[PDB]
Design a protein around this ligand. Sequence first.
Ligand code: ANP
Ligand code: ANP
Ligand code: MG
Ligand code: MG
Lengths: 482, 483, 468
Amino acid sequence: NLNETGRVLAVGDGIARVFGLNNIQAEELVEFSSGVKGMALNLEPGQVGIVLFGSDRLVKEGELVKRTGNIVDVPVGPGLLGRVVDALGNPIDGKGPIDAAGRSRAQVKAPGILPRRSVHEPVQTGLKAVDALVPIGRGQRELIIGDRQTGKTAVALDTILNQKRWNNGSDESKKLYCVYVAVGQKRSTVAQLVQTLEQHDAMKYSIIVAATASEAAPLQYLAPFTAASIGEWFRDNGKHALIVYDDLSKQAVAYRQLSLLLRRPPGREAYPGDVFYLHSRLLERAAKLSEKEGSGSLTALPVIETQGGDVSAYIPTNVISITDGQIFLEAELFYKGIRPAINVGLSVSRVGSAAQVKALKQVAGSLKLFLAQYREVAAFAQSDLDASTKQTLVRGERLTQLLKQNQYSPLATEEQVPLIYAGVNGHLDGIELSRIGEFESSFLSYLKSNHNELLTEIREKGELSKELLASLKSATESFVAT
Amino acid sequence: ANLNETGRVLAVGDGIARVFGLNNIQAEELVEFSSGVKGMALNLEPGQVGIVLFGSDRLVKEGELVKRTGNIVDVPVGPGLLGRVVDALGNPIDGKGPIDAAGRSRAQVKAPGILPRRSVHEPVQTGLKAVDALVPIGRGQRELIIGDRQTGKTAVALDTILNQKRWNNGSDESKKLYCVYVAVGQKRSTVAQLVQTLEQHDAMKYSIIVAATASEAAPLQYLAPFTAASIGEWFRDNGKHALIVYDDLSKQAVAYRQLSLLLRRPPGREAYPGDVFYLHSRLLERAAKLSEKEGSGSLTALPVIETQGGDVSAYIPTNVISITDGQIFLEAELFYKGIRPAINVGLSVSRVGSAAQVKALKQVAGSLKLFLAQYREVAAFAQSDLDASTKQTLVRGERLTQLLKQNQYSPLATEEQVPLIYAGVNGHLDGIELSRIGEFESSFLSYLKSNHNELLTEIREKGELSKELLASLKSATESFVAT
Amino acid sequence: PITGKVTAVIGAIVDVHFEQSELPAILNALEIKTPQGKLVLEVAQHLGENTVRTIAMDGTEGLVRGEKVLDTGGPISVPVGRETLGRIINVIGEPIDERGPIKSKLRKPIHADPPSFAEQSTSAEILETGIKVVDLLAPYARGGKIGLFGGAGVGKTVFIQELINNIAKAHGGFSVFTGVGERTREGNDLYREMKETGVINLEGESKVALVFGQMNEPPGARARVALTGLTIAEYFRDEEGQDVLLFIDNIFRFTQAGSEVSALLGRIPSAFGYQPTLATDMGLLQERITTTKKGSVTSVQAVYVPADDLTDPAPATTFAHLDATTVLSRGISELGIYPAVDPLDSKSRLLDAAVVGQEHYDVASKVQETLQTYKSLQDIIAILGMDELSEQDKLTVERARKIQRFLSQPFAVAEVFTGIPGKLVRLKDTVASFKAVLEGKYDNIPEHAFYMVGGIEDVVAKAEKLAA
Ligand SMILES: Nc1ncnc2c1ncn2[C@@H]1O[C@H](COP(=O)(O)OP(=O)(O)NP(=O)(O)O)[C@@H](O)[C@H]1O
Ligand SMILES: Nc1ncnc2c1ncn2[C@@H]1O[C@H](COP(=O)(O)OP(=O)(O)NP(=O)(O)O)[C@@H](O)[C@H]1O
Ligand SMILES: [Mg+2]
Ligand SMILES: [Mg+2]
């Protein structure tokens, strides 16, 4: 036969070198005699180089290999909501077949120059520190970067948890569907994550694509692109989806493993010289589409693990240059108690204020300023100081404390602005730092009991009129004195 | 078609061309390809020749005819190359037509051995108050100009060439310094704008520009300094004196690394090949003063190296520093402030040019060398005391620091220099404001030229300072300082 | 009609077989017809046995050993001339704005030889930029390259857009903006703002041409796009005699892309991972930006510095080619000065008594030295107050503060965002205007009159409106 079939020349280390397959397409899925699949990455003169999707004890020299005729693709559509799939879209949750609207290629061209509209709509994380200081808009790529065990996943997960507000409504323009890509994590971690989303009733709008620690590198390499197509169905049909790639370090690692094994030329840190293309292919697919094309959007929170905060390392550098900003998390801030351990002076949203609820932009425009000033004068915290430099100190200390938050408890926008109006505009400088916790708790509940009126208007108009600041000022000053 | 004289291309990529045949080719022989592009036979094997291209690979296809030359890589030399601008293969690029050449020296020539040399003793006059007093350059010496990006490195070489106009109009055949300026990896415009500066100052007539610029294939840049050496050597070989400026060897070493990596040689320190020391060493060793038994001709090299952020311990800086006979180190920190030439005195040395210093400079610059490296002592530890004892040093130093400051394209005669350094060393500036030191020079040199031209003619003629002429320099300086 | 056959596919690297002596020269474009459209391949090597190694300009997924490959006869060619203006173009000269074909009168090969040493202009000369800060303190070289520093938050796209404007009005030259590795979201951003600002005018006349080579394009495409844009920019010089602007944003991403291609072709990396051809690759592009007897390409190139390490071979090699720099700063922005040029940080090789004339040089030098003495006072002005100022110093501080505000200027392009009319200030104005201020002829005009105005007459006029 030979055009549609091949024989195995040699096999080992997840590579099978195959004779024949004369009509195979670059990156076509293939199928071996034992039942393991794999994909044609190297079309060479005498032979094809195929990376295995399964243990290579399954393949032997001489074994028959079959074309399948299709480039790797994946089932896409709402039939996947609440499901946990493998990288190829096979369900693993024990919940039976996945009904697909249709199938879609792993690799797909990102929306070009033209079919995009400027990012303008909030992705509400519900995290004061983020929403106030590093606002993400629908369409944006905002990196979550930091060392091990710093809070990277939490920042995505609490964002995912926050979408409850709109995903429990009927207006689909407000809804944010959720794709979480588990790459290179151990299985119980992904299982413990799903158990959490299930507990917070956030599975119902989420998709978990999980290519885990003990899976063939190509599957880990593929998971991000595969899920990006899953996420793209939403984008491409006038809806909005958030995708979290957790994390791109580990993907980079599997890609590298493939490349070295296929003997492609290594470079800095032994990554192939197209690793940057690997991530930009992937992250440019997040986009806000133009009105002409549905106005749908995909939004990406990629995760990157750093080593000793070394952003200069190859992959961190690639990704930091590809995205639209970093939320940068730090061990030290964490132990200090500053959780999320966001380092403000190092974090950015390149979209910024256009991605932010006008109400929050209003009270927190200054907030941007002060913490900046706080940080310059910071080391003075240790006596004989100005009335200028101590006021800076008093206010900062408090806003820093305001911005602390517990895990799994993202706040509504109408709960954030009054907390941040309070901070920014001096109404906290009297309260001792130990109580800014119990204060936030007590102030919101009080505001709920008595001033449900303005909470609603903040939530509904999203703006703050002049009467509203004056009302807010009244409700705040009345709570402080008591 | 002979397989001995002719070849067919097997493959071409990464600057190399593989040719089948050429069975009578020599190791290091030039070849001509179908399109006119030339190459060199680098590696000679059973069944194929490895040829390095002197141009874009686009210019050589598989299956192409390649003709032998018979000739090892070489250039035209001779006196007919003055006022010309050639490329690395000696091809004329100034549009001024055929090169009129006395003949063809090779690119790789061996340096004269232990025997055929004499020590340096004659001045290469730079006209730069700092160089000629503190780092004197001999005729046959090799003095490295070294410093960061944009620190007046080229400026020293250039003003040295524009200073040669002085004797390069004269009858005396021996005090003539013919020049070779080698542009390696420079911008095409910079080199064109540089020629125009030699043209305006009427210096182009005694100089030769060899250029392999930013865009040209690496082996051309690699080659340029060598074919410049042969061009220079002619003068050395025929009882004359050529000055060669390699601008710069940094970029040559970079070109050579490209060539090396494309050829897959083991990369060492900073990915330079094992033999990058050797690349330069064989180059700069072709500068010599010859013994009268060989015609006394002299080649003098002023190579330029570019440090990165002031670090002289880098691989390529230390290699050339351990080939050359000294360094004029120019400093980003000084240049930023205004002290230009930014000759960091402490870190600058001439190793053989001692004998070559005009006595009159040596006399008024007596231990000015070791004082200035020691005004640097107090000036770095006074920023601690208001000491009357150490404030005259800080005011000799500060005045002398302004005294050695110089405008560009303004090289000075020996005679113009000695009285400036007399007025400094002997303290005649201590009462004069700092902001007027630059006005002192210009007023003083006019006052000297208008009245005391008898003293000025005499320094030039002797090359010495008679106790009479020093007792007179005292009178003219005190007289002008009071008014 | 020269055909070949794909014999190898590894990522963006494709090998192709041809018949003896029908082999395409290195750098020739090849074409495979996809259902997408067309896949272009650039010849890079003759491997032997009639095969060629090539680098893809788009994805190679779905390719098949044996697929037919047409030889285009030459390098990648791109539309040139007036018809390119106002259009978006990818590396291979295709329109990507969905506005139909560029029915340009020609197409030109992106790989071309630079002007000869003979063709080279002999005297560097200023490019009058209409912008105050720049023409006085760090003037652009005509034919030169200028590194534009600082990213978001500093008014960059407007600075760039006013240059396009002012040049097209004061010299009748057009512009080519080439985005190399730009973010697509930001390419879209820029297109929308060029229409808003008027520099792209889809009905009327357009001042600029857009060439984009995005991050998600394979290394080959990103390596090459700068050339495409340049080739468009060259034709306006060579056939129109125009002084032309070429914006390359970002030049660092061109180095990175070149680095990536070299790795993929199997070349041994040089120092720090960069290609071994880093300098010649840089040379091959930069050397084409220059003055000819016809006119000049003048390029403004955003430069990114990795880890702020000016010694990393990337910037080091880039800097060797820069004639001047324009440094936009958050520090100048926050003070209220538009554009946000740092007048003590922006430097020019052409700020030289020889190039600009002694009048020009003397003014600019004192302006700097003034603002420099003023900087080291910002410390003690905050502690010792103001009263403790000496005879010369009390006056120069109050004067610097006026000069600091005279360096700001309203841009004609920003008028839609601002409401303030825009002024194009001449060099003869700028030097003269600042020469008068320095001497003490306007020490009795209150600060606010120097802020956001054109030529000296605009200080006089506004000061007499700040009295009504
Ligand atoms: N806002 C928060 N407040 C308090 N604790 C938190 C917060 N966010 C995260 N944590 C806890 O801090 C630890 C690390 O957070 P986690 O989200 O696991 O970070 P990570 O970067 O994913 N670490 P890893 O993935 O294991 O490299 C976990 O115990 C979290 O429960
Ligand atoms: N004695 C001098 N006085 C004042 N300016 C000078 C002097 N010498 C050189 N310069 C100027 O300083 C700048 C840089 O000097 P240059 O001679 O080009 O140094 P360089 O080391 O060649 N820089 P580059 O070649 O770009 O690495 C130029 O504008 C020179 O004209
Ligand atoms: Mg995690
Ligand atoms: Mg130089």
